[PDB]
Structure 1
């Protein structure tokens, strides 16, 4: 990784942004390789304050990626995620699965439509059923396509476990336990009703935001439980009953792309 034999920070930040590198060690290493055929990368290794620049650069790119994701409307955002979708699947892969899980495409399309706008009480789609019915399967594939984030209720003892809600456009709380559902009930009523929540971030002061769209998976039916009365009118549920087990379903990013490109009209994304 030859490191030896006037530096503009702009040019570097640019390069990092273009390549979507946000992480210092990557930025550092990757720019050092570019220096074979890049004058500014060559000038960088001549600098004494490399470590400072690598840091700054990460901070710079982290600022931009974060703030452009926030700036785009939900349609433009989905549009962006469609462009990122490589390979080729089909929206049919998705329909086939719902058919298998005996749920209405139409029900889903509506739910999703309103979930995407983050309309109050329509902001949270639960995917409920016993183990191995492809709940994780579908939800994670959707989050992936969407550029979402997974929240782990394991980390709930720290209140920072919600930090990413100040960032994503969609979020998934995987495998909800009772603990977790009543957590929702206790603390997050406002996330469901589209009122503001103070989300604490680690190295800087907390921010007040509207909680982005939420997915949940669970073995637990909230609508069928009395102790979660508040949740009934705020959580849209879908039950999966059907096994997915061979030593058959794998929704891809292109599957979702086709799904959105094709039902774009029906999802009110115009």
Structure 2
């Protein structure tokens, strides 16, 4: 019985972080119970157009908000989302199982996070079924990164995801992958800016976000990869996780990483400058 207001629906959509078309349409039509704006939305002869614009607008808002946040603020906004209970002792026990003292790994992650160039890629190289996939992919899951797949490297759009995410991982790199890295992506693995081709739009020149790679092939030994000995940090995982112990004796969850970052806020050198004293407030495109 009132005039539709697109802004209210954009704000409500952003409240629940609904971005895709079908979800916003379905959830709003189900929410027409106690939302007079929704009941004004249903009887409008341009529902589809409004859904399309609402999704686009929420996408703009979320993309800009994510891009704005600096690394300490981003890891804070992800320690907020890490739900569960569990200490960091799993991390230390796993690394001592792999006979790698923690301090080296901390002294490499410290640099890797800052994107210091020539140190912008970890390598976890070891035999299959050694526990590189679980660790690396969990660390990507807790940093909200995207997995890059080498299957479609013949389509040069496979690097499109590097325009958004903050920790990319390509897993089980073959020899062709290492040669590809040495030959094409010399700049990105260095850390220097590199162009990114995207779909239907314009190429965006961006920094090279931090990476992670797991591969059976060692690179600190193959002398034909002489240009990668100094540009990566290789940690050797040479022991098996899935041993005779019934379950995988070591498994890693968001609680482990969350308490890992809360306890190691200092030794990773993370800090926001001065102002964290207020009551909550956020973008409000509703009026």
TM-score when scaled to structure 2? 0.89
Gaps of 5+ in 2: 272-287
- 1:230 counterpart SS class: coil
Range with bigger deviation, 175-184 or 6-15: 6-15
- In structure 2, what is the Cα distance between the partners aligned to 1:60 and 1:19? 14
The equivalent residue for 2:155 is 158
Deviations 1:16-51 (A, max 9, x none): 222111111111111111111112222221221111
Say which of 177, 189, 206 aligns to 2:186: 189
- Cα deviation for residue 105 of structure 1 reads 0.8
Q: After TM superposition, where is structure 1 displaced by more than 4 Å over at least 4 residues in a row?
A: none
Q: Tell me how far 1:66 sits from its aligned partner.
A: 1.6
Equivalence map 1:167-182=2 (5 Å): 167-182=164-179
Q: What is the CA–CA distance in structure 2 between the aligned matches of 1:230 and 1:64, rounded to whole Å?
A: 41
* Structure whose alpha-carbon radius of gyration is higher: 2
Spell out, residue by residue over 1:211-246, the C-alpha distance to the aligned partner (whole angstroms, 9 max, x if none).
100011111111111121111111101111121226
Instruction: Work out the CA distance in 2 between the residues paired with 1:47 and 1:192.
Output: 51
Most deviating of 180-189 and 245-254? 245-254
Q: Which runs of 5+ in 1 are unaligned?
A: none
> TM-score with structure 1 length normalisation?
0.95
Distance in 1 separating the partners of 2:47 and 2:233: 51
- SS in structure 2 opposite 1:131? coil
Q: Does residue 90 in structure 1 map to residue 87 in structure 2?
A: yes
Kindly indicate which of the two structures has a greater share of residues assigned to helix: 1
Aligned-pair CA distance for 1:210: 0.6
Report the CA distance shift for 1:42/1:227 in structure 2 as closer, same or farther (over 3 A): farther
Shifted more, 137-146 versus 12-21: the winner is 12-21
Q: Does 1:248 pair with 2:245?
A: no
1:119-164 deviation line (CA, Å, top 9, x unaligned): 1011101111111111110111111111111000112111111111
Question: What secondary structure does 1:222 align onto?
Answer: coil
**Residues 113-132 of structure 1: pairs in structure 2 closer than 5 A:** 113-132=110-129
Deviation, structure 1 residue 107:
0.9
Aligned residues: 266
